[PDB]
């Protein structure tokens, strides 16, 4: 018998270990793999797909589909805010989205985010909007001037419905926390660059949709259980 010496940790069940273990079904030969389309190798494949942000989370629109669109008015000639969003990604509203829910399965955050916007108004309706990400260490911008001084994209609605802008990863440290709580990653704020113009006899109001995905940039680390789902009771057999 070989002299051997036992070490701290032995006997212990650690959830995240990987060790070998006798197979209970020896000699069993598993079914052929076959070809199924759409294999996922890596979670980031999902974070990289456009998901719709529940931008309108008011108590009034909550459980409808209208939570997913914002409304623009021809009634307004003005530098008015339309909406704003915390940019951290496990944050509300964006936590519900693909990239959020997944980020919510990790404790660490980094990359650039791709916000794309689709204008759903009449083919003959036109507007120019300002889309702005204001970096952290300051308050959510209260005016068009204040917002525009940051990173922005002026969007002109025309033949192509859509535009994508990006919030660069700009941060003190290489990674960020998915549940920061006090610290912010910045804001993204939408304004009227001109006005929503309409012809005769066409709807005065038009909607706007909002999407997020990650860039090549994006990465998550330190896997943790998700905060966006729970089990209250017991589950029926």
């Amino acid at each position: 018998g070989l002299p051997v010496f036992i070490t701290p940790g032995s006997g212990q069940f650690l959830t995240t270990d990987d060790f070998q273990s006798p197979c209970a079904l020896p000699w069993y030969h598993p079914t052929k793999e076959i070809s199924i389309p759409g294999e996922v190798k890596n979670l980031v494949e999902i974070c990289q797909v456009d998901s719709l942000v529940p931008i309108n989370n008011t108590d009034t629109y909550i459980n409808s589909e209208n939570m997913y669109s914002v409304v623009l008015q021809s009634s307004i000639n003005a530098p008015d805010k339309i909406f704003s969003i915390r940019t951290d990604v496990a944050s509300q509203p964006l936590a519900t989205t693909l990239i959020g829910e997944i980020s919510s399965y990790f404790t660490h955050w980094t990359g650039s985010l791709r916000f794309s916007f689709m204008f759903c108004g009449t083919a003959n309706t036109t507007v120019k909007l300002l889309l702005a990400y204001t970096p952290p260490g300051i308050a959510e911008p209260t005016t068009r001037k204040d917002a525009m001084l940051g990173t922005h994209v002026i969007w002109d609605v025309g033949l192509q419905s859509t535009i994508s802008m990006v919030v660069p990863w700009i941060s003190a440290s290489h990674y960020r926390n998915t549940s920061p709580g006090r610290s912010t990653s910045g804001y993204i704020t939408c304004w009227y660059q001109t006005r929503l113009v309409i012809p005769p006899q066409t709807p005065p109001t038009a909607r706007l949709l909002c999407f997020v995905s990650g860039c090549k940039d994006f990465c998550l680390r330190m896997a943790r259980d998700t905060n966006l789902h729970l089990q209250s009771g017991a589950i029926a057999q």
């Binding site: 069940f13 959830t15 995240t16 273990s21 006798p22 197979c23 209970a24 598993p30 079914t31 076959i34 199924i36 389309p37 294999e39 996922v40 190798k41 890596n42 979670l43 980031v44 999902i46 989370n57 008011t58 459980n63 914002v70 805010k81 909406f83 915390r86 509300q92 509203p93 936590a95 519900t96 829910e101 650039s112 791709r114 959510e140 994209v153 419905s161 859509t162 535009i163 994508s164 802008m165 990006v166 660069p168 990863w169 290489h174 804001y187 995905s213 860039c215 090549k216 940039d217 990465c219 998550l220 896997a223 998700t226 966006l228 789902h229 089990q231 209250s232 589950i235 029926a236 057999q237």
Partner: protein, 280 residues
Amino acid sequence: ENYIDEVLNEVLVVPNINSSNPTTSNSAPALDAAETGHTSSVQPEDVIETRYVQTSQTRDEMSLESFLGRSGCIHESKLEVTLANYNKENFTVWAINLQEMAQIRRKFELFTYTRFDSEITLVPCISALSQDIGHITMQYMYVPPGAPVPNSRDDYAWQSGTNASVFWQHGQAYPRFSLPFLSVASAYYMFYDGYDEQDQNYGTANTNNMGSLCSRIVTEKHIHKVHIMTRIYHKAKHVKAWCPRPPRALEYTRAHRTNFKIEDRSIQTAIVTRPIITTA
């Protein structure tokens, strides 16, 4: 050269950000149509003047193997041991599902189909209800569809002539063993849009029927009342999955069904309301 590159956890790397310059052109990469069903191609360097940064970050941890490859509890079986001639009772039976505990269920339900070998790990605990405990040995036998199901602490089927059983006794460390991917098809179904031959039982009920996990206390009649609670833990090893689906938004009602509705309770997502949309 891959014993090294994965010891500091660096295979699978994130691209660098390149420097970028003032653009003036007819090429509008920021402008696409999301109507196509295609996600935009724009990258930081396309819409803003960026610097060169060498990105050291790693996707290893985000791999399917990292994500499913942690064990979590899929079942809790309580054995309340009676002494009413002791042999008529005192056994668990559990039909085998990843579906009765929400945390791991949500994770695998991120995909439509999944395939993998399994590592089952057991955490038995004896709650002592008498002055003492004595010597408790337990038996856990896997009873695949069609195998004889034990009806008493008694019956012959614990002979386990060809079945796999594993034994635990107080003071022994947590049992563990591996399973080979067991489905009859090429992958496990996390969801099923069909019924049985009889046109009944919509859903996963039909697909993966692994049979049952049966528990019995094997130590012969004795005087101490105890309870034994063995918790079952499951790690996925060697994993592939296909067709990502959106993540479960609501509490789980029932196994093998997507039913979300609950009695006299408002239907409640994890989204959180705001007073007004111009303020974050």
